[PDB]
């Protein structure tokens, strides 16, 4: 136990299921892998500060001071990509490494680092896809005005994005402004389990001085305004050759109705609106979902007409970060129910078990990843049918192997990860067969890394990081399958 | 002009399109046909009072003092039904004729009248279906406590319903508690064009001392509570033989999205929720649609758990009163839009013309009846798929011939009405073929009658009332088609 | 007014909706743009003669003496194509410029002109598609034997086509023999509104000495025989490398049944047979539609077996010239109906309004272009399902901005044209998704031009021709959208 049935061998995807232009890759983020947290002039991020001031808020009491040491070891990351035959690497730029004070003087050592990584990727026939921000805010701006809670973040972000465009845009042609705004707003400002660790008085987070009903929406609104400003600038000044693309990457769960009835059908649409539509609908039509405005009202800021027009059609490419699905169970509006957390505003509870008593799918290791590839195909067809079928990349997809799971004693023997990934790659094929414009699949993660409030205890890598042997990269079974899948010539 | 294309002859329904148990009939209401407004002890209704105090609020300055004089001439109504071969007559009981003071002593002359009509119908092999209330509130209760705006209406209604059950239930086996609660709430308390004629200060109605954002919902809430009390009583004490049925009859428009986009898809669902779900969803699940609660909030009263349980599953039969359809056009929530009328709360405007510039269908006479039979089939399949496929009767369906329409110079030559009715009867067949549990079709109206704020200027009858020749009943072309359709033996 | 709803921004096509080989372009014709009508030895065409002898038959009393002056200004046409990022230009060769006397000595100045245009296109990475004849008959042949009414046109055309193949075929690899034979036969010989302007005695055209029941079919028969001879020659002598293609371009309207009944279903098939099948069915199977032979009989010439075999499978590529759709309304055969115009022979009237009284779609400017993109998808699926799914190019598609339309005061602000074109490009995507072999979309027109009997009063261009400023080319809003769509590098 617990029952883990693998695909039959004839059901395993082959590279030629996908056309020649389809892109397989892997993703990381700066705080999760780089280390060198204070090296060569780098200033502290909100994640540096959060870990150093509230260390107990990380599961295993670790932090990203060193992580996988990719600041020094990036050539081994490149080698792992090459060895697996990946065509794309999606990585993030550390704002605090580039602009130690958030604003002002650029750190040339930071510029030099990303240039080396970019040039090495290109030397090795791997295309760089760059996430500009991945939760990674300079603590200087957090101290100065409250970071994403203040409007000043909009212009400061724009100027940081411009440094990235100016320095890297001659070679980097594909950009994501923000990664997982919904996760970030919920966890950083609703539950407060993520940096800067804020929540309402009386709640259990590092800093219970916020407002779990308001601060998530304030932060999300500034993200969207920052995104709109950066894209306007990009399209006006940094796409002169017409061959660059900029978008946003969204965390998305699939949803099924908890019970077969029109009420859970309605709840399911509210859940998708809340999880996905919150940030996707603004970049599509220039406003939040109607459901959210009707339920959240004055706690959800209004866009001006100028802002609406700037936001509408502001993505060339959409990233979907998909792991799992939930059942959506209707909650009635009544005096017996009063929202206290931002997620309460959907009036739909996310359930791991459905009306018949069954889990949505098999657990994969970490508590929240239940396997349900159907959910991904469903979301991709929503993108197709509802939102105009924009170009979609799966920019994260994968599972954790968890320390203490006795069904996973050899960290290299990740047949469960491999099976999960094969099933989701097959689910992408299903969506493509049904007309969804899906352009690539990027596994999270390239290498085991710092899993936020769970530290190193959750390993998401295709490639093992041997923390006791100098952070050496070792290909897992899943990685070696990708070598075969991608027809990498053998030694 | 204007273009009115008729069905091809092979597309005209035949009686055998429907099974042997399907019921064809016609409908009327007490204020619209009875006259004798103050005869034999009858007390005044809100419609008596409205017309007598604000006569100018009726188009042609008429009222229902005499109407079709069916109080004296009901045998001619029965004869018209028989001559057309109708199997059902749906008529209403005048509360103020039965209980002149709303409460207290029953008027035996009122009882005697309905007994004669019921017995004549049964003598003539026509089944009576009885609407208990059709907008027809005793002015005594209006004066005493504000009628449907006060909770006292709930018990007073229950006691009136009980008088009807006690006196007529040995012979009448099919009941509708209320007719068109949505029309009544919108027009009587929102726009105020109908009795008692109330609306917000500054609006143009007889009594601008109300609140068009609140009074419609207060009135509708009491209707639902009154319905729940009457049905509980009926099922406990007046269905001992197990063969009686009680339900409610709803005015419903079909809706199509104004423009092909997910936003007007969403608007269309809000329009259906507002028009149909407002009263239907309470009698199905025991609460209002979620959409309405989310948009109306404190202006929409809450049900107690006891009330919810009483309301859920409180209809044996559903009546649908269908005339026409609209395009539903999304309205955004923003500072630029502030509801002032209850209908504003759907955030969906009802449009007669769609995105391509075309009317939804041909005009039929009166300004609001655009022909669109597709809309009826669509609503019937919603009943099937969403609300459990309860037994449905089309309890009103038809068109007006309007005074001054030069395309309708002979009031008996109603080929346009006939064509409309044939097309809607065919639309019911379509729904039945698709599995909808539709049990009958009742034309509105049996006879030309008092059309509320339009007076006698709109003629809806299968049977002409010759107002200059003693209110004589004369069969129109449509009526004579029903004689043929129903295989009535000829003289 | 009048209501013009635009696509939602997420519904606007993107270039990547189409595969890498799909071709976007624009079209013109020689008489409509070239001017220089008598320059460098060019002889007069039937259109020169028609305008110079019956000037009043042109709306605004203009002609194509100068047009857009593309004889001198073709480099600006090329520049406009390049600026929009178009990959194909479809233009026509003026027969009377190449062979001033129709037959005999070739005009080397004419040859030199087309060589310059071809070479400039190729220098600018634009592929030339060449229409050999576009209504453009030498008046010498018209005077000599009645042009397309005489069999001699067949060989004379063949010899002209051969001059084009010999001189241009080393570089031009894609050819259309004839453009819009159905429009030409109807308007030039039925109604007579187009050159040479012939119709039956008693009708209102310049020369009422013809026969509107016969001359259209005689002319069309010679077109088909000329096409068959030119293609036989081409395939035998001018496709030695195997990489050239030759076809024909057909004007086509979509049709819907006027009323839902089997009779208008039948009428709709006769309308499509008459409009499209007249010329398409011969090049597919080698005979006219059966419907036309059954109704037209002796007025429709027979093909010999040799001719049938030559015609069958004589197109490598099909062009569809699509603007609009109509309702098709059945006409009975009876003594009360006697054809007088060739179009009467379909026994199906083309109606702009349907049975419900609604226009088929919104008017776009000129009286005959009602927007109905569905109609194009429908026709493309007929090509797929009925006629073997040959390679199809949309070789014309667009709208006119009309002088005096107060809803179009700035001739550059053609958002209505842009919306129409986006919707039709989306309709082509729909057809492709459904398996139709559609290979390109060419907007009519590249530049505003001479719109036949309407003169310059109808502007169809992506690119404005400023007639008061030296015939300068100015990109309209639609043109600038194509620059973005095609990712043209910016200055
Ligand atoms: O719990 N989640 O749904 C969820 C989603 C994305 C995430 O990136 C994380 N996370 O990093 O802990 C958590
Ligand atoms: O305007 N309406 O939708 C509407 C509906 C039902 C009705 O009964 C009436 N009415 O009696 O005037 C009007
Ligand atoms: O009226 N038409 O259907 C129609 C079609 C194609 C055409 O090219 C023209 N035209 O040039 O006037 C007219
Ligand atoms: C997406 O999810 C993974 C797994 O939770 C995180 O580690 C990444 O930072 C986030 F982008
Ligand atoms: C349903 O509609 C008809 C026509 O508007 C009214 O006359 C009836 O009273 C109502 F029940
Ligand atoms: C196709 O139609 C356009 C618009 O009517 C004409 O100008 C062209 O000559 C014809 F090819």
PDB file of C-alpha atoms in Angstrom, chain A residues 84-212:
ATOM      1  CA  UNK A  84      17.736  14.600 -20.533  1.00  0.00           C
ATOM      2  CA  UNK A  85      17.454  16.214 -23.978  1.00  0.00           C
ATOM      3  CA  UNK A  86      15.213  19.047 -22.737  1.00  0.00           C
ATOM      4  CA  UNK A  87      14.695  21.886 -25.253  1.00  0.00           C
ATOM      5  CA  UNK A  88      13.580  24.617 -22.812  1.00  0.00           C
ATOM      6  CA  UNK A  89      14.641  25.727 -19.328  1.00  0.00           C
ATOM      7  CA  UNK A  90      12.345  28.022 -17.423  1.00  0.00           C
ATOM      8  CA  UNK A  91      14.237  29.791 -14.575  1.00  0.00           C
ATOM      9  CA  UNK A  92      13.588  33.044 -12.650  1.00  0.00           C
ATOM     10  CA  UNK A  93      15.611  36.206 -12.131  1.00  0.00           C
ATOM     11  CA  UNK A  94      16.227  37.279  -8.539  1.00  0.00           C
ATOM     12  CA  UNK A  95      15.063  40.892  -8.240  1.00  0.00           C
ATOM     13  CA  UNK A  96      17.192  41.425  -5.065  1.00  0.00           C
ATOM     14  CA  UNK A  97      20.305  40.072  -6.890  1.00  0.00           C
ATOM     15  CA  UNK A  98      19.778  42.584  -9.746  1.00  0.00           C
ATOM     16  CA  UNK A  99      18.662  45.574  -7.683  1.00  0.00           C
ATOM     17  CA  UNK A 100      19.806  45.030  -4.082  1.00  0.00           C
ATOM     18  CA  UNK A 101      17.798  48.051  -2.876  1.00  0.00           C
ATOM     19  CA  UNK A 102      14.781  47.156  -5.072  1.00  0.00           C
ATOM     20  CA  UNK A 103      15.256  50.346  -6.983  1.00  0.00           C
ATOM     21  CA  UNK A 104      18.401  52.306  -8.021  1.00  0.00           C
ATOM     22  CA  UNK A 105      21.816  50.859  -8.775  1.00  0.00           C
ATOM     23  CA  UNK A 106      22.025  47.617 -10.669  1.00  0.00           C
ATOM     24  CA  UNK A 107      24.328  44.944  -9.339  1.00  0.00           C
ATOM     25  CA  UNK A 108      26.612  44.061 -12.300  1.00  0.00           C
ATOM     26  CA  UNK A 109      27.621  40.767 -10.662  1.00  0.00           C
ATOM     27  CA  UNK A 110      23.887  39.826 -10.813  1.00  0.00           C
ATOM     28  CA  UNK A 111      23.711  40.765 -14.498  1.00  0.00           C
ATOM     29  CA  UNK A 112      26.899  38.784 -15.180  1.00  0.00           C
ATOM     30  CA  UNK A 113      25.475  35.649 -13.525  1.00  0.00           C
ATOM     31  CA  UNK A 114      22.286  35.533 -15.615  1.00  0.00           C
ATOM     32  CA  UNK A 115      24.294  36.294 -18.778  1.00  0.00           C
ATOM     33  CA  UNK A 116      26.517  33.259 -18.074  1.00  0.00           C
ATOM     34  CA  UNK A 117      23.487  31.009 -17.524  1.00  0.00           C
ATOM     35  CA  UNK A 118      21.710  32.332 -20.643  1.00  0.00           C
ATOM     36  CA  UNK A 119      24.835  31.942 -22.793  1.00  0.00           C
ATOM     37  CA  UNK A 120      25.484  28.420 -21.524  1.00  0.00           C
ATOM     38  CA  UNK A 121      21.901  27.387 -22.300  1.00  0.00           C
ATOM     39  CA  UNK A 122      22.208  28.811 -25.836  1.00  0.00           C
ATOM     40  CA  UNK A 123      25.621  27.137 -26.274  1.00  0.00           C
ATOM     41  CA  UNK A 124      23.863  23.888 -25.357  1.00  0.00           C
ATOM     42  CA  UNK A 125      20.831  24.347 -27.675  1.00  0.00           C
ATOM     43  CA  UNK A 126      18.375  24.979 -24.841  1.00  0.00           C
ATOM     44  CA  UNK A 127      15.962  27.926 -25.124  1.00  0.00           C
ATOM     45  CA  UNK A 128      15.677  30.126 -21.991  1.00  0.00           C
ATOM     46  CA  UNK A 129      12.188  31.050 -20.754  1.00  0.00           C
ATOM     47  CA  UNK A 130      12.432  33.625 -17.996  1.00  0.00           C
ATOM     48  CA  UNK A 131      10.130  34.283 -15.055  1.00  0.00           C
ATOM     49  CA  UNK A 132      10.757  37.893 -13.943  1.00  0.00           C
ATOM     50  CA  UNK A 133       9.261  37.485 -10.431  1.00  0.00           C
ATOM     51  CA  UNK A 134       8.731  34.324  -8.439  1.00  0.00           C
ATOM     52  CA  UNK A 135       7.665  35.514  -4.899  1.00  0.00           C
ATOM     53  CA  UNK A 136      11.049  36.985  -4.601  1.00  0.00           C
ATOM     54  CA  UNK A 137      10.462  40.671  -3.557  1.00  0.00           C
ATOM     55  CA  UNK A 138      13.426  42.823  -2.298  1.00  0.00           C
ATOM     56  CA  UNK A 139      13.064  43.250   1.463  1.00  0.00           C
ATOM     57  CA  UNK A 140      14.164  46.881   0.941  1.00  0.00           C
ATOM     58  CA  UNK A 141      10.804  47.589  -0.751  1.00  0.00           C
ATOM     59  CA  UNK A 142       8.975  45.502   1.860  1.00  0.00           C
ATOM     60  CA  UNK A 143      10.570  47.683   4.594  1.00  0.00           C
ATOM     61  CA  UNK A 144      10.125  50.902   2.608  1.00  0.00           C
ATOM     62  CA  UNK A 145       6.384  50.715   1.842  1.00  0.00           C
ATOM     63  CA  UNK A 146       5.020  47.204   2.425  1.00  0.00           C
ATOM     64  CA  UNK A 147       6.033  45.698  -0.928  1.00  0.00           C
ATOM     65  CA  UNK A 148       3.051  44.448  -2.945  1.00  0.00           C
ATOM     66  CA  UNK A 149       0.578  46.116  -0.580  1.00  0.00           C
ATOM     67  CA  UNK A 150       1.586  49.544  -1.900  1.00  0.00           C
ATOM     68  CA  UNK A 151       1.042  51.085  -5.370  1.00  0.00           C
ATOM     69  CA  UNK A 152       4.676  52.058  -5.553  1.00  0.00           C
ATOM     70  CA  UNK A 153       5.464  48.376  -6.307  1.00  0.00           C
ATOM     71  CA  UNK A 154       3.931  48.891  -9.770  1.00  0.00           C
ATOM     72  CA  UNK A 155       6.541  51.326 -11.062  1.00  0.00           C
ATOM     73  CA  UNK A 156       9.391  49.691  -9.139  1.00  0.00           C
ATOM     74  CA  UNK A 157       8.519  46.344 -10.763  1.00  0.00           C
ATOM     75  CA  UNK A 158       8.269  47.982 -14.167  1.00  0.00           C
ATOM     76  CA  UNK A 159      11.786  49.394 -13.798  1.00  0.00           C
ATOM     77  CA  UNK A 160      13.136  45.977 -12.709  1.00  0.00           C
ATOM     78  CA  UNK A 161      11.463  44.310 -15.691  1.00  0.00           C
ATOM     79  CA  UNK A 162      13.054  46.960 -17.923  1.00  0.00           C
ATOM     80  CA  UNK A 163      16.558  46.088 -16.560  1.00  0.00           C
ATOM     81  CA  UNK A 164      15.826  42.450 -17.490  1.00  0.00           C
ATOM     82  CA  UNK A 165      14.553  43.391 -20.989  1.00  0.00           C
ATOM     83  CA  UNK A 166      17.545  45.727 -21.642  1.00  0.00           C
ATOM     84  CA  UNK A 167      20.179  43.250 -20.491  1.00  0.00           C
ATOM     85  CA  UNK A 168      18.740  39.910 -21.557  1.00  0.00           C
ATOM     86  CA  UNK A 169      16.171  40.551 -24.316  1.00  0.00           C
ATOM     87  CA  UNK A 170      18.634  40.232 -27.171  1.00  0.00           C
ATOM     88  CA  UNK A 171      18.774  36.510 -26.315  1.00  0.00           C
ATOM     89  CA  UNK A 172      15.742  35.791 -24.125  1.00  0.00           C
ATOM     90  CA  UNK A 173      12.585  35.931 -26.291  1.00  0.00           C
ATOM     91  CA  UNK A 174       9.967  34.410 -23.933  1.00  0.00           C
ATOM     92  CA  UNK A 175       9.021  35.932 -20.577  1.00  0.00           C
ATOM     93  CA  UNK A 176       6.570  35.381 -17.722  1.00  0.00           C
ATOM     94  CA  UNK A 177       5.995  38.491 -15.608  1.00  0.00           C
ATOM     95  CA  UNK A 178       4.692  36.668 -12.498  1.00  0.00           C
ATOM     96  CA  UNK A 179       4.416  33.068 -11.323  1.00  0.00           C
ATOM     97  CA  UNK A 180       1.412  31.782  -9.335  1.00  0.00           C
ATOM     98  CA  UNK A 181      -0.206  35.039  -8.204  1.00  0.00           C
ATOM     99  CA  UNK A 182      -3.156  33.135  -6.672  1.00  0.00           C
ATOM    100  CA  UNK A 183      -0.895  30.867  -4.547  1.00  0.00           C
ATOM    101  CA  UNK A 184       1.192  33.857  -3.513  1.00  0.00           C
ATOM    102  CA  UNK A 185      -1.800  36.040  -2.499  1.00  0.00           C
ATOM    103  CA  UNK A 186      -3.508  33.179  -0.589  1.00  0.00           C
ATOM    104  CA  UNK A 187      -0.425  31.928   1.265  1.00  0.00           C
ATOM    105  CA  UNK A 188       1.546  35.144   1.772  1.00  0.00           C
ATOM    106  CA  UNK A 189      -1.388  37.356   2.839  1.00  0.00           C
ATOM    107  CA  UNK A 190      -4.350  35.096   3.623  1.00  0.00           C
ATOM    108  CA  UNK A 191      -2.971  32.131   5.603  1.00  0.00           C
ATOM    109  CA  UNK A 192       0.416  33.850   6.004  1.00  0.00           C
ATOM    110  CA  UNK A 193       2.458  30.649   5.760  1.00  0.00           C
ATOM    111  CA  UNK A 194       4.603  32.256   3.032  1.00  0.00           C
ATOM    112  CA  UNK A 195       6.716  35.427   3.083  1.00  0.00           C
ATOM    113  CA  UNK A 196       6.075  38.098   4.277  1.00  0.00           C
ATOM    114  CA  UNK A 197       3.896  35.873   6.494  1.00  0.00           C
ATOM    115  CA  UNK A 198       0.827  38.064   7.132  1.00  0.00           C
ATOM    116  CA  UNK A 199      -2.724  37.200   8.207  1.00  0.00           C
ATOM    117  CA  UNK A 200      -5.615  38.593  10.307  1.00  0.00           C
ATOM    118  CA  UNK A 201      -5.271  39.183  14.071  1.00  0.00           C
ATOM    119  CA  UNK A 202      -5.906  35.975  15.976  1.00  0.00           C
ATOM    120  CA  UNK A 203      -4.652  33.708  13.202  1.00  0.00           C
ATOM    121  CA  UNK A 204      -1.518  31.559  13.396  1.00  0.00           C
ATOM    122  CA  UNK A 205       1.085  33.117  11.173  1.00  0.00           C
ATOM    123  CA  UNK A 206       4.360  34.928  11.819  1.00  0.00           C
ATOM    124  CA  UNK A 207       2.752  38.350  11.517  1.00  0.00           C
ATOM    125  CA  UNK A 208      -0.965  38.420  12.459  1.00  0.00           C
ATOM    126  CA  UNK A 209      -1.257  42.160  11.847  1.00  0.00           C
ATOM    127  CA  UNK A 210      -2.798  42.013   8.373  1.00  0.00           C
ATOM    128  CA  UNK A 211      -6.261  41.238   7.034  1.00  0.00           C
ATOM    129  CA  UNK A 212      -6.853  37.879   5.343  1.00  0.00           C
TER     130      UNK A 212
END
